[PDB]
Every structure is written in structure tokens, then in C-alpha cells.
Design an enzyme around this catalytic site. Sequence first.
Site, PDB file in Angstrom:
ATOM      1  N   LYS A   1       0.602   4.518  -1.836  1.00  0.00           N
ATOM      2  CA  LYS A   1      -0.478   5.594  -2.235  1.00  0.00           C
ATOM      3  C   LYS A   1      -0.258   6.775  -1.349  1.00  0.00           C
ATOM      4  CE  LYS A   1      -3.564   1.506  -1.072  1.00  0.00           C
ATOM      5  NZ  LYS A   1      -4.279   0.892   0.067  1.00  0.00           N
TER       6      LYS A   1
ATOM      7  N   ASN B   1      -8.428   1.759  -0.107  1.00  0.00           N
ATOM      8  CA  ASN B   1      -8.029   1.086  -1.181  1.00  0.00           C
ATOM      9  C   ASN B   1      -9.451   1.203  -3.018  1.00  0.00           C
ATOM     10  OD1 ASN B   1      -5.921  -1.225  -1.256  1.00  0.00           O
ATOM     11  ND2 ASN B   1      -7.192  -2.251  -0.242  1.00  0.00           N
TER      12      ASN B   1
ATOM     13  N   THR C   1       2.841   3.297   5.410  1.00  0.00           N
ATOM     14  CA  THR C   1       2.958   1.825   5.535  1.00  0.00           C
ATOM     15  C   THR C   1       2.332   1.064   4.290  1.00  0.00           C
ATOM     16  OG1 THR C   1       1.250   1.766   6.935  1.00  0.00           O
ATOM     17  CG2 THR C   1       2.862   1.881   8.626  1.00  0.00           C
TER      18      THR C   1
ATOM     19  N   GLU D   1      -5.113  -5.834  -6.326  1.00  0.00           N
ATOM     20  CA  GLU D   1      -3.842  -7.614  -7.537  1.00  0.00           C
ATOM     21  C   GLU D   1      -1.950  -7.216  -6.576  1.00  0.00           C
ATOM     22  OE1 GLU D   1      -5.420  -5.420 -11.328  1.00  0.00           O
ATOM     23  OE2 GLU D   1      -4.884  -6.738 -11.099  1.00  0.00           O
TER      24      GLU D   1
ATOM     25  N   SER E   1      -5.272   4.163   4.178  1.00  0.00           N
ATOM     26  CA  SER E   1      -4.729   2.933   3.305  1.00  0.00           C
ATOM     27  C   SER E   1      -6.391   2.613   2.639  1.00  0.00           C
ATOM     28  CB  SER E   1      -3.726   1.537   3.813  1.00  0.00           C
ATOM     29  OG  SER E   1      -3.303   1.233   2.539  1.00  0.00           O
TER      30      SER E   1
ATOM     31  N   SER F   1       0.837  -0.790   0.294  1.00  0.00           N
ATOM     32  CA  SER F   1      -0.175  -0.141  -0.209  1.00  0.00           C
ATOM     33  C   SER F   1       0.612   1.246   0.654  1.00  0.00           C
ATOM     34  CB  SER F   1      -0.942   0.319   1.199  1.00  0.00           C
ATOM     35  OG  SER F   1      -1.962  -1.248   1.035  1.00  0.00           O
TER      36      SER F   1
HETATM   37  C1  LIG Z   1      -1.772  -2.309   1.479  1.00  0.00           C
HETATM   38  O1  LIG Z   1      -0.552  -2.713   2.190  1.00  0.00           O
HETATM   39  C2  LIG Z   1      -2.899  -3.560   2.604  1.00  0.00           C
HETATM   40  C3  LIG Z   1      -3.744  -2.448   3.311  1.00  0.00           C
HETATM   41  N1  LIG Z   1      -2.744  -1.501   4.169  1.00  0.00           N
HETATM   42  C4  LIG Z   1      -2.158  -1.852   5.630  1.00  0.00           C
HETATM   43  C5  LIG Z   1      -1.680  -0.972   5.749  1.00  0.00           C
HETATM   44  O2  LIG Z   1      -0.354  -1.149   6.844  1.00  0.00           O
HETATM   45  O3  LIG Z   1      -1.113   0.234   5.593  1.00  0.00           O
HETATM   46  C6  LIG Z   1      -3.592  -2.870   5.762  1.00  0.00           C
HETATM   47  S1  LIG Z   1      -3.110  -3.974   7.674  1.00  0.00           S
HETATM   48  C7  LIG Z   1      -3.984  -3.088   8.189  1.00  0.00           C
HETATM   49  C8  LIG Z   1      -4.431  -1.082   8.608  1.00  0.00           C
HETATM   50  N2  LIG Z   1      -3.356  -1.671   9.727  1.00  0.00           N
HETATM   51  C9  LIG Z   1      -3.623  -1.271  10.912  1.00  0.00           C
HETATM   52  N3  LIG Z   1      -4.537  -0.132  11.208  1.00  0.00           N
HETATM   53  C10 LIG Z   1      -4.559   0.576  13.006  1.00  0.00           C
HETATM   54  C11 LIG Z   1      -3.336   0.503  13.871  1.00  0.00           C
HETATM   55  S2  LIG Z   1      -2.569  -0.798  12.898  1.00  0.00           S
HETATM   56  C12 LIG Z   1      -3.192  -3.252   9.836  1.00  0.00           C
HETATM   57  C13 LIG Z   1      -4.035  -3.341   4.591  1.00  0.00           C
HETATM   58  C14 LIG Z   1      -4.055  -4.454   4.813  1.00  0.00           C
HETATM   59  C15 LIG Z   1      -3.949  -3.918   1.093  1.00  0.00           C
HETATM   60  C16 LIG Z   1      -4.752  -5.423   1.982  1.00  0.00           C
HETATM   61  O4  LIG Z   1      -5.018  -3.263   1.177  1.00  0.00           O
END
Ligand SMILES: *C(=O)[C@@H]([C@@H]1N=C(C(=O)O)[C@H](SC2CN(C3=NCCS3)C2)[C@@H]1C)[C@@H](C)O
Lengths: 267, 267
Positions: free
Chosen positions: A49, A108, A212, A145, A106, A46
Amino acid sequence: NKSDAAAKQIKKLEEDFDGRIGVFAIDTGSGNTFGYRSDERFPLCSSFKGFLAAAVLERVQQKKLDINQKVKYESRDLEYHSPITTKYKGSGMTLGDMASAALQYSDNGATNIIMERFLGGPEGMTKFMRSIGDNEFRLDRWALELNTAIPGDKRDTSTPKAVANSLNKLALGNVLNAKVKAIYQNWLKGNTTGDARIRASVPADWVVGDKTGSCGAYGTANDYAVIWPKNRAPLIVSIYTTRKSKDDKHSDKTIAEASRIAIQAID
Amino acid sequence: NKSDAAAKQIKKLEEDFDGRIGVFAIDTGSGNTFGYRSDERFPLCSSFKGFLAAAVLERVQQKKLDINQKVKYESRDLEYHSPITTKYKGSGMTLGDMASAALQYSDNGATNIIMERFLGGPEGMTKFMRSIGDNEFRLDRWALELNTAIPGDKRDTSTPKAVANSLNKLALGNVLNAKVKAIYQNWLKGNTTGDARIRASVPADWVVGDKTGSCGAYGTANDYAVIWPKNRAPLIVSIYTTRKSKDDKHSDKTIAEASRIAIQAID
Ligand SMILES: *C(=O)[C@@H]([C@@H]1N=C(C(=O)O)[C@H](SC2CN(C3=NCCS3)C2)[C@@H]1C)[C@@H](C)O
Ligand SMILES: *C(=O)[C@@H]([C@@H]1N=C(C(=O)O)[C@@H](SC2CN(C3=NCCS3)C2)[C@@H]1C)[C@H](C)O
Ligand SMILES: [Cl-]
Ligand SMILES: [Cl-]
């Protein structure tokens, strides 16, 4: 030998969780850098972004888009992990709110809407990066994807160094003018998903902005940050990690720790 | 280091009630300021009514409206919490009385009538704010629909700093001429809903004008004030709070206390 110490520690850190750590860090005041596997490829997840949101702001600055224009998506089948866009499906969101949601949570849905309507998709996201001087960044696939993180697969990868340089150019340099760059910083600073990563590596009174990423495969996770220490020039930190096995989980602690090592290496 | 002390105290206050406090304070006589999360977004709630009433007075001053013109609404289904407009439904009210009721009692009927007939609704309320140099203020929704205070939601938010600056411009500065600004001050001074907030933070012989807001969700409440200490230059204080959980109640005590800390920080 301060460089070489930092390197021995990243090498041990990577052996301890049985994977692969890439780091690049810049002290923007001295120009001092530390790198470890800083020219190897790692999945973006991600994390792109953060650059997508910069791309939008570039357009806003060129008057190609307005930050307050309504983006409607009443009919969209929202992608998994669209916590912000899900809430506003009925009314729509401003382009600004949507781009920041793509960054801060993040989202989507925010990501894919913006790439299909404003940015020319993965190819256009890649063109944006070439236009700021970034030759390693490639986005090949859409929000959900791109998370396959297959070892040796070059799709949707960059290098820690390319990520650092780009963030420096966008967050601190001259791609965005004074007004719009500040907006970008506010957006980075308000990121909500990186409390256990670079943020955990620095004193609580340092100000941080980050994005992240977590592929959820091959223990692949990353984080990149602009850091404002008290009464010191900004730092740029960029940490990418992957792991041996498909089913491995990512390690927040390794990211935080590799950040600690990196910030010390340029001290 | 007096700044940093005040900040440590707000941070602890925010941890104690498990939420988020935003503060900005100005001593107009020295120019000294203190802020804490002063650039972060917080829901306006009713608090925008203070600016709405300024907008009306601007129009009165420009001869676009008359302060004594009858506003009739005999057939309206009055919104919840219209204690003043309910009282005059039969006869109507002067534009002046109506705008002040929107301020002093947080009358939603006064609010919505004025925005629909005279101010161009939420977007016009926002245009007014842009026109005085306020770039953070956005009103998106109408009186009763703006109180959702959803975490992450940028609709109907400003920053403590933007609110402070704007109040300074309107209550003490040059937006309104001397006659009309005095009317605005009288209005602020006569506010009836803020006895437990900034008012509670200052000696009872100091003269205060404020507007409060209480979303009734996510413990979200705020208050902003022009304070006249005896034989000292005016102060501007702006306190915004939210809380972790939907069902949390707002804390007047936290607002009063954060005001005390703020007023000491600019001493
Ligand atoms: C992209 O990586 C992915 C998104 N992106 C994520 C990310 O770490 O930015 C999440 S993982 C999830 C969000 N988290 C937290 N937020 C609050 C405390 S920790 C853990 C997710 C998987 C893809 C799948 O869209
Ligand atoms: C806006 O915030 C809402 C109305 N405005 C309020 C306010 O000004 O604080 C709230 S709370 C109401 C004022 N009050 C008092 N308690 C102490 C003495 S007066 C209860 C009010 C609902 C509207 C609904 O949007
Ligand atoms: Cl990837
Ligand atoms: Cl798509």
C-alpha cells in the site's frame, strides 16, 4: 566481518522464533548496504500500500488525477479493516486522503477503490513497479485475498532488496518531483501501524516513515522505512518475516530486533 | 540546543495531558523560528474565522464589497453561538461589524452568512488561502459541522506553521494595504475569547491580537496571535492541540504553557 556478524545474528534470530527473516538496509550517505536473504521472496501483505500511494502521487504529478477530487463510494460493501473509509462513506473522501488512509491505517477499502478506479488493479500496480525499475515485485490479488502467505507461493511477493531499492527511488530519488515527494514523505512519516517495528528500533528523536504488513497467516509480517537520524544521511530499512506453521503469530519483537541488527551492520 | 530544549518541554507537556501539541513561532525582527509538529495537521475549529475576516477585508480593498454595506438576515434561523448576530437580527449589521463579530466573538451566524453570500463557502475560503501562498489550509464544511475533530480526519485542518506564516502575511505583510491592515489588527487586538491562552503567556503590557478555536470534542483547541512586545519587533505564535479521547476537555493551561515555551525558544 561486520557484515558477517550481523548475518550470524539474523540467523540466530530466525532460529529462535523458528522462521525466516529477510533484510535489506542502505545508508544513503555512504552507499553501504547490509542484506540477509535479500533476494528471497516474501509475501507483501498490506505493505504494497506504500507503493500504491506513490503510484497515485505519480498520477497527480502527471496531472492525470487531482489530489482534491472527490471519490464517492456511497454504495460500496466496504472490505474488512476499512477504519477510515467506513467513517466517510456518507460524504466521500479526497483522492489524497484516500491514498494516505490506504497507507497510514492500511485501509483495505481505500486500497481496492483506488486500484479498481485509478491504477488498473493488481496488474497495473505491478506495471507501476516495473516502470520504476523494480523487476521482483508482483501483486496478483486484491486487498483481502492476498494474505494467504502460502510457503513457496510466488503470488503477491517481492524481495527485501527490491522493496528497499524501490522505497529509496520513491521516497528519496527522482520518481516524484520535489513537491510531491515531500507529500509522500509526510504520508510515510504519519504511518500509525508500525510503532512496535522499525520505529521501536531507533532513538525516539530520529524521524521515521514506514509501511507495515501482517498477513495473519504463517506468522508473516513485515515493515519498511525511510529513517532520518539526527544530522546524518537517510537510512533505508526493509524487514520481511515468515514462520514455519500456518497458525504461528507474527513477532513484532523479531522485526524490531532484526532492524536494530541491520542498522548496526551499515553503521 | 535551545530549539531542542523547547522541544523536550513540549513533548513532556503533551505526555502529561495525554495528547498532541503543535507549535510554530516567528520573531519577525530576527526571523528566528521555533516549531514542534509544525507540519502535522490539526483541526482549525473556529480559528479559520481570523482568516475569513481577512478575506472580507481583501474584498473591501479590491472594491468588490463595501465595509458599510447592510447585511440583512431577518428570516435566518441563526446557528448556535451567534451572540452578536442574534442581537442585530431585526436591523441587520454592516459587513465590517459582521466580519469582526465573526472574529471577536466567534459568531457562527456571521461566519456562515459571510461564506454563503460573499466568499464562495468553504471552497472559496480555501481558494483565498491558496491565493496568499497557503497550501496546507483546507476548509471542507460549514460553521457548525466542522467541529467533529475526528482523529485521522484531514477535513478542516491546517498545520501550525501554515497558520503562523499565513497570519504573518495577513497581519504584518502585504496582502492588505496599510489602512485595511490596520483595521484587521484592531480586529485581532479586540478579540474577546483568548484571555486564557496566548494572552496569558505574556506580560499584560504587551499588545496582543488573536483568534481561538474550541471544537468541543477530543479536547481540541487552538490559538494564534500577533504579539507586539514593548519596544521590540512583532512575534507570531501559533498553538494547536488535540487529545486522545472523544470526551477529553481542552486545556487552556497547556496552550498558555506551550506558548510560553515557544516565545522563549525564539528569544
Ligand atoms: C494487511 O497487512 C492487513 C492489514 N494490515 C495491517 C498492518 O500491519 O498494516 C493490519 S494488522 C493490525 C493494524 N494494527 C495496528 N495498528 C495500530 C497499532 S498495531 C494491527 C491488517 C491485518 C490485511 C488483513 O488487510
Ligand atoms: C469554534 O471553535 C466554536 C466557538 N469558538 C470558540 C472559541 O473561539 O474558542 C468556542 S468556545 C467559547 C469561547 N468561550 C469562552 N470561554 C472563555 C471566555 S469566552 C466559550 C465556541 C463554541 C463554534 C461553536 O464552532
Ligand atoms: Cl502477500
Ligand atoms: Cl476488486
